[PDB]
Amino acid sequence: SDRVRSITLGNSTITTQECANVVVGYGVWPEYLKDNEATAEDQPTQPDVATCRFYTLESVQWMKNSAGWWWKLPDALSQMGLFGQNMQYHYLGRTGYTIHVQCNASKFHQGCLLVVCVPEAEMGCSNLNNTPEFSELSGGDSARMFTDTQVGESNAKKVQTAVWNAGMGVGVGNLTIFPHQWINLRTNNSATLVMPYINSVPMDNMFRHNNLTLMIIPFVPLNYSEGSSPYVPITVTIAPMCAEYNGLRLAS
């Protein structure tokens, strides 16, 4: 059958019994850095069993009148085990990810999500003169949520979270040009994306640059008759792939 997968990374295994196919990047697989493109002169650290495993983020609830969520994920994994320790003692670092969003419901529920993973997402602020601060842009393994209203401008520093403009000023329908999948509760049960390292430099600092953004937007909202289970959660498990670091220093 074409509905069962099994992904094994490190000492963790994610299985699924009904699913769509897996979408992989822009056609490439995450691999290490070659000697033609390297610019640093110290030998990198590849632990590759301790940091290449599945880390499970916190769960969010899919209500009926929900709008959306987003994570960043060079930053959502900053407190998760030995991946968050190598980010502190090192100055550089590159990695690729594999993302597995999972959300299950019965045959009597209905709904549809859009699981997209965009690179270099600059967000717009509510106040037209300032740029948004750090704690309004990203939370460590905690989802920041879209709204379906318009955020006022006289707040200090807040992201404009109108969901039909997706926070970046583009149409939310045209977000399907990025690598994406749909979780349709009629057929699908989980989405899987394998993302390579997309950046204009071969290595970058991991504490002041978030080169990805995982957005989950419900296009057709959740609905059910009276009697079914009203609590439907969403859980996201991310796993780094082929990670390496340079520039060992103090803790910061």
């Epitope: 709008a67 704690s135 879209f146 709204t147 209203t149 006022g152 401008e153 200090a156």
Partner: antibody, heavy 119, light 107 residues
Framework: QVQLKQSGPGLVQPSQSLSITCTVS????????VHWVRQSPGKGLEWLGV???????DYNAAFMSRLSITKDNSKSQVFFKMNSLQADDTAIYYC?????????????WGQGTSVTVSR | DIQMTQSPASLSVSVGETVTITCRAS??????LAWYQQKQGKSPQLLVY???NLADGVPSRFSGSGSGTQYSLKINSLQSEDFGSYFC?????????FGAGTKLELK
Amino acid sequence: QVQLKQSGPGLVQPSQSLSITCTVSGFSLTNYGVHWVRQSPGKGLEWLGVIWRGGSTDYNAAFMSRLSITKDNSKSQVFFKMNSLQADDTAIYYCAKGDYYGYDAMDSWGQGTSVTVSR
Amino acid sequence: DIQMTQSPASLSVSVGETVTITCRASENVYRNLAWYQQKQGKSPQLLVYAATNLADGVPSRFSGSGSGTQYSLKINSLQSEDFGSYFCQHFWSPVFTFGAGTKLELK
């Protein structure tokens, strides 16, 4: 899950300072902001000030020169201070957290301490 | 700033009928409105946020609607535990202002 609660002085002399400490439980100050709302019997409900999740504050216009709200992220406590305490400040003061699914509404409120400004 | 004029100031109705409480802003707030309910001598509880959405534990008797400047709240079947006060409080812009207040005697 149990939520925030406060503790105040109760009775304050005129032209003095007032300080209620609202301590929280079950969440962090790195994700939510705590408002301060004054329930008055004569002027009704009114909004005094807020401290956001980033640390910046935003006060009311009429209470600008007297209010000062700070917090500590580690001990999970917020502090507020009003000065010069005139006669109409006999009311009950609430602390309440914001960001109800990103919508900046108050979900849970403190028990409220009733203050009196008189001798 | 912006004022919220709430009407009517009081009501006297019985158990099981449909009422409607409205409040009007000064200018457009883009559906940034929250409704509260306060009983005698406790803290106010959030009832309807963002002018349409329901809260966590609030049953489906309450319903809020409106857009632009005119908003409303409607209970189709009023019950015995639902008296008290009701306020509307916009969060579009600091300074946030509350409503005047409505009272339900349930006579």
